[PDB]
Amino acid sequence: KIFKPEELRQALMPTLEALYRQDPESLPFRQPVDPQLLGIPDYFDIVKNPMDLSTIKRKLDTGQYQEPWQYVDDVWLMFNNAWLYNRKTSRVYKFCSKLAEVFEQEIDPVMQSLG
Numbered sequence: 254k255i256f257k258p259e260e261l262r263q264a265l266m267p268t269l270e271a272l273y274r275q276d277p278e279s280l281p282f283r284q285p286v287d288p289q290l291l292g293i294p295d296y297f298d299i300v301k302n303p304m305d306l307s308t309i310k311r312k313l314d315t316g317q318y319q320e321p322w323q324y325v326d327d328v329w330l331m332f333n334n335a336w337l338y339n340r341k342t343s344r345v346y347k348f349c350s351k352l353a354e355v356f357e358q359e360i361d362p363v364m365q366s367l368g
């Protein structure tokens with residue numbers, strides 16, 4: 254179907270806020286990765302399509318998504334980037350896995366209610 258921006262925002266924002274409420278696990282993901290500020294200069298050699306919570310939130314707030322799977326795609330892109338770049342034993346990788354667990358619990362009833 255065709256989705257109105259306000260409809261997508263009201264339905265999907267709670268799933269995004271569930272990620273933000275994870276503390277400390279959302280902290281690596283709330284703003285875009287700046288490899289200079291973080292001291293990880295090889296980041297963009299590995300992560301070619303960056304994504305983060307602030308970008309997703311702004312896109313959802315300002316109507317940049319036409320349909321809900323575009324939002325889901327961006328969330329998983331953020332997770333996949335972090336699992337690709339960070340080592341399996343690293344703190345940031347483990348934090349990512351926690352966010353993905355939360356997202357999987359929240360997203361399916363919302364997607365079913367949408368469409």
Ligand SMILES: CCOc1ccc(C(C)=O)cc1-c1cc(NC(=O)c2ccco2)cc(-c2c(C)on(C)c2=O)c1
Binds near residue numbers: 280281335338345
């Ligand atoms: C270099 C190691 O950091 C990273 C490496 C890789 C990635 C990714 C997303 O692949 C992200 C980080 C990372 C981590 C944290 N915090 C913690 O790990 C933490 C908090 C408490 C305990 O541990 C904050 C920020 C951060 C940002 C993005 O914007 N601001 C502002 C920030 O502070 C970035």
